[model samples]
Target: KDKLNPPTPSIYLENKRDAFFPPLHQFCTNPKNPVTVIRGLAGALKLDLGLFSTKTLVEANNEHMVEVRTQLLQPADENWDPTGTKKIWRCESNRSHTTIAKYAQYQASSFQESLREENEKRKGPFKTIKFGTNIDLSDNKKWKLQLHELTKLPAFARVVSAGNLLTHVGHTILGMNTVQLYMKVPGSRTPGHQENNNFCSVNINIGPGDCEWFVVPEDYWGVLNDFCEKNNLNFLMSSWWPNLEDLYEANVPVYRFIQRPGDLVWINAGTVHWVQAVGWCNNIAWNVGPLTACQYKLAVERYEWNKLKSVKSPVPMVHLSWNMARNIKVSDPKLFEMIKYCLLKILKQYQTLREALVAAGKEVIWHGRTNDEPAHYCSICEVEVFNLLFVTNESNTQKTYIVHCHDCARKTSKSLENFVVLEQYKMEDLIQVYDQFTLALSLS
Candidate 1:
């Protein structure tokens, strides 16, 4: 083992890329700065009835809660704003800032969704905890009416009418937002999947689609029912008339580790997830990231990056191409100056993390380091080793593909290789010795 006394995390060192973070000392110079780890995996995520107070929310969150991070619009730029805090942003998009004057009808939609939902057995107002304030949805009698009326309130008015949207894909329901970091169990992550008889409630996670919500065998849930309550776990929501989408996104699961009152639990459209534990109550969940750059890059002519969402829907879910292009614009220019830089920064870093018998190095080809050395280059992705690389073993060990690899696959998963720093461990030793240093929390 390297040394837990002063643990070195590879993510920190790799984040300090000299070329990418030219002004490494400045706070805003680089986006690769690893986000702080707020470990709050104590209880399961629950929709409390406000029975839990603020203190309980904090305690249950394990101190990983924070107000949803929001970027406030600032005065254009000033002597004090040399960092360009107020600048609009680069890359324009297809969607513009247009207000929807249809207020009455919009409010009607709120009532409509609520009423339609209520008839489907979603009568009682859901007990939910959020960052902003207490949202007590308790009226089993006139909850739908209350929800509709609430839409006319100042908060909802400002929110729905503002019409802040981005380049809808060619014709898709998806829209392109900033390069936000979405988390998911991957596919079928959320509970209440339409499929039931094929229900499965198995342990073990491969990362991405691990605890997906297709429907656990009723008996499986019954067996572990107590384990869930005692540990604050929740059964996957049933895929019935009333759904949890309004209360939470469709596929993201909240883990014991990430739920906290006054904190933010967010992810992009299909990042897959489910509630891991049931706490006293957590706070409002917000899916947030930067919107400035994503909205501007939609040109609709020069390249595919500019397309609105997909070419068939009005929803804002843009294609992955939009995501890749958006990321390139914000975090890669400095690292991807040419083909070589692109290879090293984007390709080599993530191809394959090797554990050699004696030493380890990056395997830039298929079956790398194993002797076969067959070249596996993705002509489209142009990332030969990294893009299409997969460990074909029945063990289903993908060297590294996604942070949620364990959930995505059904086996042991690791982060995407070649894309980031690869830690090396002795074949005899289990844990890899990463090139790392410590940034201890300040005492002052």
Candidate 2:
């Protein structure tokens, strides 16, 4: 079973050959090339794709409305302010709505003011930065239509849209397919974090200004996590920005780069990164799950880790595995075997659990959930609830359903009368899909 897994590559070390930074044409022409994909997985890369111009993007999204948040920033020297003496940056919690064009103008004006001699003298103890981050492009029909047009533009002609596993899956699962926009000014910075579900991210800086990025490879994630843990820091929420000098002392390799206008940044799977705008800029980024055994392996590992930590996994691994099994034809033997193994394990567990429930006299009701429907999570444990659901109605008149996993349901209530099981798929239907996938693989 272990042989089905790909061997983990050694830690990446920077060299003169520039193995990570491939030419734009070569990469765009054959983005799915195995070696190139593996290289990207090992580290982050900067591609001088010159894909989009700032003027063009500003005009393209000029009239689009966005919600902006005021980000509180403390001086770099006082980052880890342990004392209560230092004043923290304070701002109103109110989120304002404005057109992208207006936001751009505001950012430009503020950035210009920051450079003035008079404003420099008036610098306060703390500062406020306002920008729009993670603005969903699919919130409304108009934005969705605009996103479609933006991706189809000739500027993105050579990009690797086809190689995205989310593209093959054909629907957004847990915000995977939704395109997000980031608009920022000089003082704004994104906190250090990894992408959900271990999906690689591609960010294009459509900018008149530059952005600085700090990336740590997937291999060093453990090192960084341990360091944060030892310091009693919040690793997941990433409340504190890492001191590069400390990371250097700890021997964690950091990839530092400045992303200028028209440049694209490829952040590999599981990479921990943080970004700061050098000037005013707009960035569009989205996650992509490549059809590789390594990617699937990392995703599943993260899913299990999230479970152990009692955190909700945004991407439901069980649902994604079944969906991939039914929809995709895998050419890579390793990838196919891994997916098959996952499906078999899931099915076996489902069968054992179902049989026990039946023997115990729990009532089962058919409630088939389609693939496109959002996945249900246990209200108690926050785990993804798949084919099997232990549901209880809180209100008799309103019929409000509160779902739980088998374990939580059992722990919460001893009586079977308190909850009923909802079956999303018949066992035979799931078996048929598994069998069909296996047969298709053999035929191909």
Candidate 3:
């Protein structure tokens, strides 16, 4: 199958569900990138301001969130009016009100307690995100100076809120593992605009045989996400989404996998995917849609939300109630039927899945599995959905699913309809990946 938005130079691209990443990078035209190569880069590295500042991967050895400062190796100043009134930036920025407007740098408010364990401590889980026009400082050059002396920080943002087009949306937590770049994407396409192209890296948990677990960005508002993009066109948030979608449906290839150095190896933040177990895989993924907007209150967004309440600035839906609806194939139909019958009392409509599970008569699990994050209370839901997940199970690790009617609300075990997990089984049953910087214990 051919992908839209071919890799930068038009090389004969090979798509695989499981490929040896580091080996592919070195052996193939686009060799995989290791920490050594990344650490040796001269200029221009990308990272998630929500987690760390540098694009190079780090071995998060200490506790949760690391305090760091950010300084762009280069000073980029440009005004992006996306609407054509002013000249927008061709690269990244920390000066605009869009994403880089909140602060001059990213400070850690929280971090994981132990990278070796999960839910250890909570005060800091490796992130401190601000919203609106606020930040550590506005002097970009000053932060550049900060970088040389900065040692306590695992990573730091050179220009702080003065760079990049992505806004920190939410935190993603994997019970048995971690995930990489979880971003909200717009429903439209933007050709090949690198402005919105965010660099993401995370852990890679590969298993034996063939299976995969790709850690994507978590949605803070519990909405369909496009926080990461090919460029800062603000595609979905902008008026171009319609045109972008039309182009894609018409075979124009507006969006697809960015295809990194390796086939599907996982790195910390900017990397696409990786494995942890015995199996090996190299599958690429691409999903276009909107978001539900988790009603999460950030120390930064909270202030903005409060200010909006003071002036009624039309607050964005940052949170939502728990959504328990799920879609899954029942393995134990008898057990599944018990729940399906209980669902009869639920306001949701009973579909063939219930009958099918009942007909099976075993301890059926059903059409979908459970999702930890139920869209309970939020403002928006993503449009045109597809899910990305790395499955680690008895079978293939590259299993992904499309929960089309998963929004029936009353049909799931938790809250929404139980369609299918992004992959097929429980995440715990699969290998997992994460930023690891976000791991932690309970916070007081």
Candidate 4:
């Protein structure tokens, strides 16, 4: 739980009968088929790349991949040469003999629509080159044509259906959803890495060829940790992949598989996986999150860890929670209560400090709701007031100065400046509602 790696691997053999195995009631997380592949996508995801020539791709997105750009990946004198010295990034000079030499990352909300929009508008480059060193395409229209064809695929409809349903539930529960696409060329290798943020990932290969992935399970992470320290590995700044030899020597099973066209592979949270393209490949990937409540807890814990480490690249836990809890009055009241239960635990810790302040002859302010006061928003921290909110009244002012979130109030200056909790739900009422829901959940 301390690291982002899966306990096991599972795969759902995507077939006619297997499609409905979990039905709509079960998520794809069933461990029984961990590291399995849902096949039958090959026929559906097939595409004709005949129109994508090198000239078209360069004109489409020329920022980085423009013109022949080759760099010295490693000096000839260096012993540690990953790509045997120089690497060809994008060569317009010799399009005939080019190895993509590197992985290309393209992010879009919906790849099909983005390509179509860019094609129709003929706007500033399409943003993602459909053809490069390894693969060549003629124009944006060509790639757009292929992408639109994919939507018509029978398997794609199912893919979108299941993906949307899962993503909606995830957003409702934890507030996370997005998708991205990666284009890989032959010999393009991905260093081992875990998706520390997303709770789930669905990878679909829309390929000219296939790809082989290697994954190491979480149980073997301890051995990798020791191996890294022993070798003085730059675990902090580097990609921090453990040696494959060390992983093999530890008797860890590497979950390896080849992904083909239309074949979708779902990777569970925290799984360490790497990829090497067997040939040219176009993969659509989605990073989803905040599924089961356990994941919610872990996300929050990880949020705390990130804050403590002062890492600004923190997960949007609170942002999502606020979105989830904002309009609970119309949502599942029981689920709303559960959300409140989680927030209450955090708010009360600050409330306790406020209580002590009240008894120690210090300034403290708490008040009940009023007809004119706003029901939501912390004026100080700008946090939406879903749980505990504090309002402050100045010594000689008619209007309250501001409302504060528990986090802000904890660090607030002490003064009898007449600060009050504006329209805060009574603690007694919150506890009663929480208890009733807890009992209801247990019985149900």
Candidate 5:
């Protein structure tokens, strides 16, 4: 599986390609090398952050946007659940049960995902106890409403729009309705981190102090990864044990910046960065990406990377793709064709996976979370599906359809070579639902 995963050389070695960063005045940049820093783009993004006053935020350990995380306990420490430990230091808040549910869900997911890329040997501890302050702002009803209404901001209009699918993908699962917030207390620090998504986020500092920031080019990820691995280093927590001599010896240039309140810092996908709080600081951030074929291709590459690493917590690439494709009416025909091609390519990939599962005689289950709302996913690859190839093995047993994605088919093919496709299913008889979209567009 690791061998099948696409090479992430950017994280392992230095690439010679030209690296480009947007000027400080630009709010957007092409996805390549995706780190863009824009200064003072937050004048209009100011909000009623009284809910996040320093004292209130530090004291509150509840489910609202004003919640706080400290390095009081390390991940490797005994009984080190952040919430459980913090609950002892702080009291509950007046947040609604529904709000609490959403907060808990996104937090757990974000933490779990952070651990997915680390091998067991390297995953023992938090490495830095002083690491501090990760407060989520999604639970703030007033903040969410403000962002929802502030879609008129020229810079934020596209992302903060109701119909934007890039932001909506996260909104659907996490129940988040506004841009996200980050707060790092005085002297608080967080090391490098990166996302699998291909979008960049608009980050506006809303705080009493500035933050020192540094980013390694996306192509430098592989170089850093390899160096850290060879020297028994931790890339994500490098700040805790950084050696400038060694880092600079590699001839890698680190882009540095300091963000004051009202300055917007744009971080593109794939760039790993670290932050150090000069004093107490709060920042507003929101992700942006739409269905340009460029972004779709990036998502596909990330999908392959996640699968290669056996990343159990998968991104909803297909879910988002289906949503984008379904809503692509009255757009550019060229773009519509690109979506069709991406879908067909995805289907062929799945079919290739199913064949391997078939040869192995493995049973794949065809099931959904619910039978009512148009859902289907491969039991093996977990890709959402419109039509899937299934097989039956028993002479007279209950019908079972084994679904597998192309990448996993061969690995799981052993011990089940007798399977045969007894049937295929399409919800609501939606055969060629994707094809029909093109037909409908052919009218144009």
Candidate 6:
């Protein structure tokens, strides 16, 4: 038996009892549902939608403009040898914007070009493929309307507007909230990486073709991460793709599978995964942060780790924590405790920093930020700037605000007068929110 050949565990929807066929939204929103419970525990799960299909997705978005990356593929015989040769697929640099219709045309043309004996024999060292990724359908009203229709379908009812803790708390978490799309032709792939800010993701292949996936369970994330670091690979942003053979040799558990049309994949929080198109296909995906202890714990843990590693946390955990405290009434004891602990720690840190700033003769201004506005992050460290914001407007002509955290502000300039401290919550108001949250949880 090949050590690297691990089959993906799948759950077939057709085999379930008739009572299990609830509205997609109802099924996922209920934490007790088997699908939800299983996803929380399993790192990756494949849900086979027996007769369901999304053939309309491609046709509807044929004319929509999408940003495409022209990736330079490495020669077929070469492998990723970081130490010996610094060559890998060049994907990040060359980019262009084109419509789905034109991209499909290009894909057809490229395939035909590859079949020509003359061109095949005289092929260059590196060939190219166009990949359209992170196409935010929410941006355009027309495109969003199409997505809205798809959400109403029985199979996608729950996935279209999945219950996300952040959305439930009345705030958009950027990449996490919107429905993003990926269009790829054969030879193009997404490098191995975990979802940003430890958010769980849902992806459905709506295709005339198929795609392959390689997922490593979250439990073995440390093992995979350590291996990447030892190999001098980029593990944080996951710019480098791992060799499956090498990973198998290292004893890493990797699930490999081919996702055909109508297949939905549920990727749990912090699960490291990568995708490769076996043929031309389009997929729709979105992140959901379920209101569970497992999701929150991983998210907060990753937030802290990102700080230590000097990486920008896409989901501003601190800001979301405060918002969650003010909005949702959590009943689960474990979930309650995690959010409460975060609030307590953040409040204490805010109080301490505010006191120190005031004592040092820094003036504080009330910015009166509402929940509708997005959270502010430090310009330098990329840390969430909650409640207190250290802003500077160095140029007299333009009143542009450059924000910084207290620590970064201090390190940025010796003179404290160069920055203005903006406060979102007064001490008494913040204390009231914290107290109300505790009382609500206790009563619930």
What TM-scores do the predictions have?
Answer: 0.20, 0.77, 0.19, 0.54, 0.60, 0.80
- Residue lDDT tens for model 1, 1-444: 111111211112122132134232222111221111111111112113232333332233322212221122122111112244422111111111211122212223544665688799922121221112112233324234323332331221111222222221222111121111111111111222211111111111212111211112122223333333343433232211112231123222222233333222222212223332221222222112222232222211112221231122112222222232332233333222321222233322333334331144433233223322222322223222323334333323554422222122223334333233222213222111111111224342
lDDT of 3: 0.23
Candidate lDDT values, in order: 0.24, 0.65, 0.23, 0.45, 0.48, 0.67
The 10-residue segment of model 5 with minimum total lDDT is 11-20
- In candidate 4, what are the lDDT values of residues 44-139, reduced to their tens digit? 333333222223333444442222222222221111323334222121112222332322332122334556877997411112222332233223
**Winner by TM-score between candidate 5 and candidate 4:** 5
Per-residue lDDT of 1-444 in model 5, one digit per residue for the tens? 232222221211111121112232132444554555544344433334444444444344444443443343222112222344321111111122223334434444544655685545552233322222334555445444535533534433235554444654543323222455565544445545555453545565667778766666666677776666675554433333223344466766666667777555667656666666665566666665543455456556666665555552234666556566565453556556766776777666656665655576655454433322333455666654444543335521554445553334435544435444332433332226566666233442
Arrange candidates, best TM-score first: 6, 2, 5, 4, 1, 3
Predicted candidate 1, C-alpha RMSD: 24.0
Candidate 5: segments with Cα more than 4 A from true spot: 1-27, 44-51, 55-134, 140-152, 155-163, 168-179, 233-247, 312-314, 329-338, 351-431, 436-444
Instruction: Write the residue-wise lDDT of candidate 2 on 1-444 in tens digits.
Output: 232222322223243234434443244323232111222211233332223333443665677776776655544422433343532222222368877777768777886787795666852444667876776665545454445544532222212356566655545553466767788877567767778877777676767687777777777778777867877765665454666666766777666666766555666668788777877877777777767787788788888888877777877788888878887878778888899999999999999999988898887788776656766789988998888888875531245656788889888787656787889899999999888876234443
Question: Predicted candidate 3: what Cα RMSD to the true structure?
Answer: 24.6
Q: Which 10-residue window of candidate 6 scores lowest in summed lDDT?
A: 34-43
| Regions of candidate 2 where Cα sits further than 4 Å from its true position | 1-105, 118-126, 144-146, 153-163, 168-171, 393-401, 439-444
Ranking by lDDT: 6, 2, 5, 4, 1, 3
Best by the lDDT measure = 6
The true-structure Cα RMSD of candidate 2 reads 7.7
How many residue pairs clash (N, CA or C atoms closer than 3 angstroms) in each of the candidate models, in the order given? 73, 0, 165, 25, 18, 1
Better of 2 and 4 by lDDT: 2
